[PDB]
Amino acid sequence: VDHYNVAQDVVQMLTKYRELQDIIAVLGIDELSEEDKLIVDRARKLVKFLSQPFQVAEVFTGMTGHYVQLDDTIDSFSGLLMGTYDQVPEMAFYMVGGINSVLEKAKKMAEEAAELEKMRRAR
Amino acid sequence: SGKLRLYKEKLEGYNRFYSIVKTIKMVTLAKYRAAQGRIRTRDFSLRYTELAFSKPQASRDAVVAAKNALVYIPITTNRGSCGALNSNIVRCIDSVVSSKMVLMPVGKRGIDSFSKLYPDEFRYGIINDMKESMHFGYATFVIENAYEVSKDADRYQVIFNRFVSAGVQRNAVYNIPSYEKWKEDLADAASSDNQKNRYLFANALQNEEEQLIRDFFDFHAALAVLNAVGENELSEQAARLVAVEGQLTNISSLQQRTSSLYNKTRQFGITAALIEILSAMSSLEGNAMKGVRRNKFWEG
Amino acid sequence: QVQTIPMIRGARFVALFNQKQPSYFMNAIVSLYACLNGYLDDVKVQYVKFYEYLLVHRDLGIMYGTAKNKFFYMYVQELNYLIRFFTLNSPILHGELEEMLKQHTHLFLQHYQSKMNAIKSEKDVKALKNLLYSCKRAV
Amino acid sequence: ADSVGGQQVQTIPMIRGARFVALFNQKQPSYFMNAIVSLYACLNGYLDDVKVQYVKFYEYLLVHRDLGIMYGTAKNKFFYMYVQELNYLIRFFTLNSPILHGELEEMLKQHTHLFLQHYQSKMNAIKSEKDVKALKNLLYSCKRAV
Ligand SMILES: O=c1ccn([C@@H]2O[C@H](COP(=O)(O)OP(=O)(O)OP(=O)(O)O)[C@@H](O)[C@H]2O)c(=O)[nH]1
């Protein structure tokens, strides 16, 4: 039942993201309501989170592949829909497997940003 | 086959139609995106204009006792596809037809509609190219022509469209009484307790010289016209975007109905042609008859 | 958006038509009668399924001790043939039918819909959605 | 797609797309060196200041002529369009290589500057009944000459 509810919720969010995408074309995101600007942020994370790096391409693409378990995927999406991961950057969901990978990528992105800012302050 | 390609040509036309109409949406959206600014900067120029002219009078005593030309200046769009704005305005004008009615409509559609509908009453119309911004000079041109049409006019009315929201465009009215009737009401609002809210405003005008009052009257009349045309433009672009979307979807439904008839036709055409050939094949097989077999039947 | 009486009842009727398993004759007709008579006007569209479930698989009046009907209690499946025989508009079964419907509507609006309208927590919203999914799939 | 009315605006992608769609017009096959060089020039924006009507004439001068040598301004040592044997060097070494990239840009820059200074300037100044016809015939001939 949890799998079905999550899948339907994802589909509904994606469908809403399409109509909101067209609304902003005539308005601009700044016009949309804050429910429809949290729903346009979660949807973008979902679209990025449905991509995955395959182990078959560990050679010609260079990125380690992932094999996400069924239960892990359900939990990861269920948490994302609720809004638990509303602080993680959008790009942390791009070409990753599972939720732990998202956290690891976010930490690496944060560390890289801090180092770059620290280097900039020196010069 | 021609019949199949007839549908293909028909669907070919609908495709270009969708592209052109979509191009129209792009143009209107740009104009609406830049005309959306007035929504921020409106609702403050006409404050003392309200006091000058805001009079919630009855709709019968105003027109029943007309002894002089009642001039109407409906606002209409140059290009069609706007929606029901022009139609409603015509209904609003048809509902007030009278002996003394004179019409000086704005826009080609208003001219075309009213030249046919009201040839005698129609005197002439004003046309503005939607190239520059709706400015004061255009309003002054509307008023000057309106006076010359009927200087001895009991009232000059402007019937335009108010853009309440993206999907709400109501019809609004600015009634402007000529100098004589206005200064008479301004004189009663000053002396009498009646029209309290206008008491201070009226007395502050009677203190000044007359030419100033006449300039005041013309200036505020121009502002009311300027607001109406400005709103009627914003309602026009908003309405066209709504209407154009309707046309796009209608032209999409037709594209989905002529495609099915084109894919249903090709399937039937293939089946029939093949059936014809096999019927001829079976006819030539049936007409053929096997002859006596000239073999050594005994040798077996 | 002008919502007249026909529009409201029609929307409720459409929501009720959503089914997964065949419904017993008594349960279906009773629910249709309640919607037809306007008892669901105050009930939101998204809560119709939950309202129907409480009417068939629960009894609010007995739960909150405000019920006095002699026979027309929906847990009595034997009433189906009595309803099929006479009607739901017969004086024999009309008074009690109205009474239980009014009590069920009053209790539902007082207790359940009021709380469902005061849910903002993300966890509670998820729980409410899961509840609605379960009710829609089960009567 | 939005150019059906609305007065299409000439962004750099459009300023270069039009030239590309005008270079593709040809009658006879093009030698690899001539084609690749012309595409590279249009790709880096050397034809942004060249009107769409004169693109074929610009290409013809680049291929069958050498403005730099004509005006005694060429400074490249080996990279000249009259050296038809550079084709295999370009095939082995891409145009985006230090061996050829430096001289290639120099020649394109010089050719573009000379063309705008001398030829296109005169073209925009044509006002007559016979010069216009001569220009039109010249452009058509260049259209099917390269
Ligand atoms: O012969 C006259 C007398 C009066 N007036 C005009 O009548 C009005 C009476 O104006 P007020 O009496 O209300 O005030 P004021 O003298 O302070 O006016 P300002 O100069 O400050 O504007 C003023 O606008 C004055 O110019 C004339 O123009 N001519």
From Swiss-Prot, chain A:
Write down the superkingdom of origin.
Eukaryota
Instruction: Give its localization.
Output: Mitochondrion; Mitochondrion inner membrane
Record family assignment: Belongs to the ATPase alpha/beta chains family.
Q: How does it assemble?
A: F-type ATPases have 2 components, F(1) - the catalytic core - and F(o) - the membrane proton channel. F(1) has five subunits: alpha(3), beta(3), gamma(1), delta(1), epsilon(1), plus the additional subunit P18 (Tb427.05.1710) that is not present in F(1)F(o) ATP synthase from metazoa. Subunit P18 (Tb927.5.1710) interacts with the alpha subunit with a 1:1 stoichiometry; the interaction is direct. Subunit gamma is part of the central stalk. F(o) has three main subunits: a, b and c.
Chain's role: Mitochondrial membrane ATP synthase (F(1)F(o) ATP synthase) produces ATP from ADP in the presence of a proton gradient across the membrane which is generated by electron transport complexes of the respiratory chain. F-type ATPases consist of two structural domains, F(1) - containing the extramembraneous catalytic core, and F(o) - containing the membrane proton channel, linked together by a central stalk and a peripheral stalk. During catalysis, ATP synthesis in the catalytic domain of F(1) is coupled via a rotary mechanism of the central stalk subunits to proton translocation.
- Put simply, this protein is called ATP synthase subunit beta, mitochondrial
Swiss-Prot record, chain D:
Binding annotation for ATP: Q26
Its job:
Mitochondrial membrane ATP synthase (F(1)F(o) ATP synthase) produces ATP from ADP in the presence of a proton gradient across the membrane which is generated by electron transport complexes of the respiratory chain. F-type ATPases consist of two structural domains, F(1) - containing the extramembraneous catalytic core, and F(o) - containing the membrane proton channel, linked together by a central stalk and a peripheral stalk. During catalysis, ATP synthesis in the catalytic domain of F(1) is coupled via a rotary mechanism of the central stalk subunits to proton translocation.
The record's comment on protein family reads: Belongs to the ATPase alpha/beta chains family.
Q: Which organism is it from?
A: Trypanosoma brucei brucei
State the deletion phenotype: RNAi-mediated knockdown of the protein in procyclic, insect stage cells impairs assembly of the F(1) component and slows the proliferation rate of procyclic cells that are cultivated in vitro, both in the presence and in the absence of glucose in the growth medium. ATP synthesis by oxidative phosphorylation is dramatically reduced in procyclic cells.
Within the intact protein, the region shown is 439 to 584 of 584
| Compartments reported by the entry | Mitochondrion; Mitochondrion inner membrane
Name listed for the protein in its UniProt record: ATP synthase subunit alpha, mitochondrial
- Outline the subunit composition: F-type ATPases have 2 components, F(1) - the catalytic core - and F(o) - the membrane proton channel. F(1) has five subunits: alpha(3), beta(3), gamma(1), delta(1), epsilon(1), plus the additional subunit P18 (Tb427.05.1710) that is not present in F(1)F(o) ATP synthase from metazoa. Subunit P18 (Tb927.5.1710) interacts with the alpha subunit with a 1:1 stoichiometry; the interaction is direct. Subunit gamma is part of the central stalk. F(o) has three main subunits: a, b and c.
